[PDB]
RNA sequence: AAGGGCACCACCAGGAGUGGAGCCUGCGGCUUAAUUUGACUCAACACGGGAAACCUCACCCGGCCCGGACACGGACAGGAUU
């Protein structure tokens with residue numbers, strides 16, 4: 766399970782240092798409605814059902830992959846949406862709830878989401 | 888006070904004048920919301936290279952903008968904000 770979660774860690778890291786990936790609900794909607802977006806990542810600890818039924822029901826009608834992570838806070842720490850000093854707060858913000866990767870930057874570690882799509886089609 | 892010398896920003900011998908008139912322009916005063924301000928014997932007053940319609944622009948009457956770095960807290964991708 767390390768070789769998939771750390772894998773999309775590296776994927777979103779190279780995506781955000783190479784370009785801008787959409788962070789937050791409005792940019793996520795406006796980025797995946799356009800027909801270039803790669804997989805979405807969204808949290809599991811959401812407290813309201815219309816938010817989650819919106820995001821899954823609106824990504825499933827597209828042809829885009831989905832990976833679900835348990836907490837939004839630690840995800841937001843992962844997605845670079847913070848002011849991380851190496852001796853202070855890891856995540857001083859309420860973390861992000863859903864992102865979408867517009868571009869990977871390069872094809873170094875695309876095999877992880879390739880086999881992710883394989884087991885999704887399994 | 889005396890004794891030497893000197894200068895048309897002194898005089899003499901004169902020339903052209905200015906002071907008088909209309910106008911231009913600079914100062915004071917008066918008036919004004921404001922009539923921005925400096926300079927007042929030579930050594931201020933067509934001077935600030937100052938002939939301002941706007942800008943200049945300081946002054947008056949109104950109305951936008953931040954072009955308030957940075958540091959520390961706060962709030963923040965369920966949205967700081969434009």
Ligand SMILES: [Mg+2]
Pocket residue numbers: none
């Ligand atoms: Mg004389």
